[PDB]
Amino acid sequence: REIVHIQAGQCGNQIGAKFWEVISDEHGIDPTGSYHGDSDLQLERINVYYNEATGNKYVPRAILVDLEPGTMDSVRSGPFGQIFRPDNFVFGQSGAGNNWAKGHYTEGAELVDSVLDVVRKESESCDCLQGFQLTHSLGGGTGSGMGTLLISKIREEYPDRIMNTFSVMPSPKVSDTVVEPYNATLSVHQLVENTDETYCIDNEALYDICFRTLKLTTPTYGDLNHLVSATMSGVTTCLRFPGQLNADLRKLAVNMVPFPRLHFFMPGFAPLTLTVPELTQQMFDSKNMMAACDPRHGRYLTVAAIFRGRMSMKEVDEQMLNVQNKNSSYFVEWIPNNVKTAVCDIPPRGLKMSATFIGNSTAIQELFKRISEQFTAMFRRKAFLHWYTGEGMDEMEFTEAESNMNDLVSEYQQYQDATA
Amino acid sequence: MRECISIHVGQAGVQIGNACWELYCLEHGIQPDGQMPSDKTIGGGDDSFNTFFSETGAGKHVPRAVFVDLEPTVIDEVRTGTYRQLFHPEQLITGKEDAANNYARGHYTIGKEIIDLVLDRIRKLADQCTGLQGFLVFHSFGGGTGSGFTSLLMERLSVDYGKKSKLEFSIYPAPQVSTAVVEPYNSILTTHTTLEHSDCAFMVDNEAIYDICRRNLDIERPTYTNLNRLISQIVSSITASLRFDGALNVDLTEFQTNLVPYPRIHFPLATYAPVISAEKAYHEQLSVAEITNACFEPANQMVKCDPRHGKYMACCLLYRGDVVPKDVNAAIATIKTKRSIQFVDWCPTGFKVGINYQPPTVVPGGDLAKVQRAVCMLSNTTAIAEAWARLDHKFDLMYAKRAFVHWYVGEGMEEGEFSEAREDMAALEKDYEEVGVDSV
Amino acid sequence: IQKAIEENNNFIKMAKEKLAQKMESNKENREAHLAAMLERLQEKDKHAEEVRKNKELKE
Ligand SMILES: C/C=C/[C@H](O)[C@H](C(=O)OC)[C@@H]1C\C=C/C=C/C=C/c2nc(co2)C(=O)O[C@H]([C@@H](C(=O)OC)[C@@H](O)/C=C/C)C\C=C/C=C/C=C/c2nc(co2)C(=O)O1
Ligand SMILES: Nc1nc2c(ncn2[C@@H]2O[C@H](COP(=O)(O)OP(=O)(O)OP(=O)(O)O)[C@@H](O)[C@H]2O)c(=O)[nH]1
Ligand SMILES: Nc1nc2c(ncn2[C@@H]2O[C@H](COP(=O)(O)OP(=O)(O)O)[C@@H](O)[C@H]2O)c(=O)[nH]1
Ligand SMILES: [Ca+2]
Ligand SMILES: [Mg+2]
Ligand SMILES: [Mg+2]
């Protein structure tokens, strides 16, 4: 069961690089692709993310994409820059300029076919292809625009495969670019229709965690990515190690997605820098959510919890039952036993034990309402639309994305108000 | 003759197959390489253990079994495990992509790609039988393979083998060890589809086994290995009449005549005793009367329900070990006067008894103490309908909102199959109500 | 004994026919779901062509 990784744009390649650094360390892979670990559990499911080559080399099954070379040139100079496959680098020169239309319809449409060639090359050699996981942002041009274009074109050639995306939501607290509410809404319009599961990485939640919790005066992108890499490692633990629960992308989607459009998850992590009760309590706390949403303002449809480290599984079972009973009001009654828990003995780097939270909560509408509020403020006065219509789009397409995202919030509220 | 073929489907069925055949080998003195020194007839035989084991010219005793899973992880462990020499490679059949806890993929999308090969391999085993008696199908309700593929296979077996008997060992889902939210869906779908193709089904409630392992064996968090080793003892008690022979031995089909009063009422409740740890069995010997009385304690049942609040349609006691009828009759007479044993008015109230003198066996390094005498009670009680009720309620909660239904429709199924399957379950619940009402 | 043979044969027949009906209806439904999925994606390509064409005309 192989997974094909794709990172597009500045944000996508930066968080994608960190993701490969963290899991390569967990699986005992060095920047040269060699294994120097001490446990056979690091290699049992190494084929999910790594291809084996000559000399027992493990090459990440990753595809690096961007409309400008600078961000990807830094990756090749990074710690594990030499571990990636050189032919899997597909970059242009014109760039996107934070223009969704350029990435989706114009400049990215020219580069998309050269990316598909690398996808087919990697996918053809898969013994049993699971699907694809994409890392990108929704507030840029390449990651938001060309990233959503690649999803549609890939789904056309692999309609029976799972499409997973690590989407980074824009926040004015981190980026001052003003056309980001446009790029995010246009991307969400595409993600609702062509992805099976999407992790919402909200930069507003990352900033608030770094500032309020971690006590950081000026959070750098490296600080935010430290939370992203730790989160991405947790939500993929069930895929990378021998496990019973949510061991692959399809079984995860079956347990997490009760309705096809409601596939936007709320990630959480603990500890943010300790006993099992504390881990369980912090894990369900709004201050530990990587999406700026309060779960107590909505109801959980489905939840996946991953505990890592050496601990008492009897205690984990008792505490997970305890939090569901003391917070029953926030779990929909019409989906019995909607909280599944997995335990991996191998903790992350530098931690005795951790906990990763994957929630499908109707409160995620708070995130889509924030972007919708920022969107309509500019669209009702038709501001900055010439950058998009100049590339060929029309106002009709902007209104469709607005209504489709407003429908998503209405549906999240619909099942929040539903009763048994 | 009277051979029985075992089919193990999915992770649950396969991993329980490992426990059962390991236990079988220990009971008959068969080594992991299949050699059986006590068997003096080389290359063949008509002994009682030949109902479950075939013999090669080289003296290997080969299980009459097929293992099927739509992914290779679980069966690969058998191909490289301790008893790997026990099975011919063609008995272990694997795919590449599993059913993802989706009945539709197990019955249709993925299952249809391997169903012909499985039937072909089953045919090879049937051709070795001089008088095939029937099949034993091990599977879960919750998994996409255990539910979807098993239903497809049961349908095909009815076509290729007519009304030849087919018995099920079904793993009823429990939240402590379940791995999918849609297990109620897969349960109702497979029960509806297999109802007319099964002659007798022994349900095993994982929560019941989970509680027994925690309560009686002091296991804080039981694993599948803990549960399966207990399940194998119940399976062994049920099949002991087929694998051994004795004067007081009573064939399983003879119990089956008493257990199934109507075709759809073929779900016996199993209760096993004694389940005790070595530390508590030391210097404590449990008599016939004590283990028999434990059969009427609801905490020892394979399915959680209250037979005190139902009516009996049959009661069978399968003893094994140091047991004589005198002790059995006395224990039963004492129980009749101190238990809530109410029979329906159209059934005789006698208890059917079988005894297999072969003592119980334990897997080395296990949690179960080795005892001199054990018993499995097979009773047909209306109370088992409670298991259908709890499961049907979970189905109704999700299906009222059509939660997760798109995963099944996307694989080619229709809502009509959900409503049709649920209606059959409603009729089944009504069937168990009707059989308990007094006659005019 | 003729009745027992006929009933067993009719059971085998009904089962064989019931199954072939389900497997064919399932095949058509799944293919139809995939064909609709591709048709929608193919309409996004037609729209993308019109968008690039619409840009060519403005200039
Ligand atoms: C002149 C102003 C002087 C001010 O006193 C002062 C300053 O500057 O001195 C120090 C402040 C400095 C404080 C904060 C900066 C904020 C930036 C915001 C920014 N937003 C975009 C670009 O910068 C954007 O969104 O531009 C798009 C292009 C792009 O994104 O590529 C770069 C295009 O390609 C994408 C098309 C879809 C085209 C579409 C719309 C552009 C709107 C202009 C916003 C703006 N605000 C200031 C300056 O400009 C400002 O307030 O500045
Ligand atoms: N008692 C017992 N139950 C098991 C075992 N393995 C899985 N289960 C139960 O079976 C259900 C899940 O079905 P599985 O058998 O694992 O899935 P499957 O049959 O392989 O089907 P797919 O994997 O979806 O293709 C859950 O309710 C589990 O609790 C086991 O070894 N013993
Ligand atoms: N967390 C995080 N967010 C980033 C990073 N780089 C850019 N972003 C976000 O991405 C958005 C801009 O998109 P960007 O990736 O730079 O444009 P692209 O190159 O066209 O994909 C902004 O809202 C940024 O907050 C990063 O390294 N980490
Ligand atoms: Ca012999
Ligand atoms: Mg940028
Ligand atoms: Mg399986």
Topology diagram in text:
This is part of a larger assembly, with chains A (420 residues), B (440 residues) and C (59 residues).
Chain A lengths: L1 E7 H18 L23 E4 L3 E4 L1 E5 L2 H9 L11 E3 L8 H5 L2 H18 L4 E9 L4 H16 L4 E8 L10 H15 L2 E6 H11 L7 H15 L1 H4 L8 H8 L7 E7 L5 H8 L16 E10 L3 H14 L12 E6 L8 E9 L3 H15 L6 H4 L5 H23 L3
Parallel strand pairs in A: 1-4, 1-6, 4-5, 6-7, 7-8, 8-9, 10-11
Antiparallel strand pairs in A: 2-3, 9-12, 10-12
Helix pairs in contact in A: 1-5, 1-8, 4-5, 5-6, 6-13, 6-15, 7-8, 11-12, 13-15
Chain B lengths: L3 E6 H19 L24 E3 L5 E3 L1 E5 L3 H7 L12 E3 L8 H7 L5 H13 L6 E7 L3 H18 L3 E8 L10 H12 L5 E6 H12 L6 H20 L8 H8 L9 E5 L4 H4 L6 H7 L17 E10 L3 H12 L15 E5 L16 E9 L3 H15 L5 H5 L5 H22 L4
Parallel strand pairs in B: 1-4, 1-6, 4-5, 6-7, 7-8, 10-11
Antiparallel strand pairs in B: 2-3, 9-12, 10-12
Helix pairs in contact in B: 1-8, 3-5, 5-6, 6-13, 6-15, 7-8, 11-12, 13-15
Chain C lengths: L1 H57 L1
Bound molecules: ligand M5U, guanosine-5'-triphosphate, guanosine-5'-diphosphate, calcium ion and magnesium ion (2 copies).
The site of one magnesium ion has 2 residues of chain A, from loops.
Protein name (chain B): Tubulin alpha-1B chain
Main location (chain B): cytoplasm
Subcellular location (chain B): Cytoplasm, Cytoskeleton
Structural write-up:
- Chain B: The modification Omega-N-methylarginine is found at residue 339.
- This is part of a larger assembly, with chains A (420 residues), B (440 residues) and C (59 residues).
- Chain A has helices at 9-26, 69-77, 100-104, 107-124, 142-157, 180-194, 203-213, 221-235, 237-240, 249-256, 276-283, 313-326, 365-379, 386-389, 395-417; strands at residues 2-8, 50-53, 57-60, 62-66, 89-91, 129-137, 162-169, 197-202, 264-270, 300-309, 339-344, 353-361.
- By secondary structure, chain A is of the alpha/beta class.
- Chain A has two domains: 2-264, Rossmann fold (3-Layer(aba) Sandwich); 265-366, 60s Ribosomal Protein L30, Chain: A (2-Layer Sandwich), CATH 3.30.1330.20.
- In chain A, the strands form two sheets. A ten-stranded mixed β-sheet of chain A has the order 5-4-1-6-7-8-9-12-10-11, sandwiched between helices. A two-stranded antiparallel sheet of chain A has the order 2-3.
- Chain A starts with a strand and ends with a helix.
- Chain B is α/β, with parallel strands linked by helices.
- Chain B has two domains: 3-259, Tubulin/FtsZ, GTPase domain (Rossmann fold); 269-387, Tubulin/FtsZ, C-terminal domain (60s Ribosomal Protein L30, Chain: A, 2-Layer Sandwich), CATH 3.30.1330.
- In chain B, the strands form three sheets. Chain B has a six-stranded parallel β-sheet with strand order 5-4-1-6-7-8, sandwiched between helices. In chain B, strands 9-12-10-11 form a four-stranded mixed β-sheet. A two-stranded antiparallel sheet of chain B has the order 2-3.
- Chain C is mainly alpha-helical and 59 residues long.
- Chain C has one domain (1-59).
- Chain C has one helix and no strands.
- The longest helix of chain C has 57 residues, at 2-58.
- Chains in contact: A-B, A-C, B-C.
- Chains A and B meet through helix 10 and helix 12 of A and helix 13 of B.
- The structure holds ligand M5U, guanosine-5'-triphosphate (GTP), guanosine-5'-diphosphate (GDP), calcium ion and magnesium ion (2 copies).
- One magnesium ion (MG) binds at residues 10, 140 of chain A.
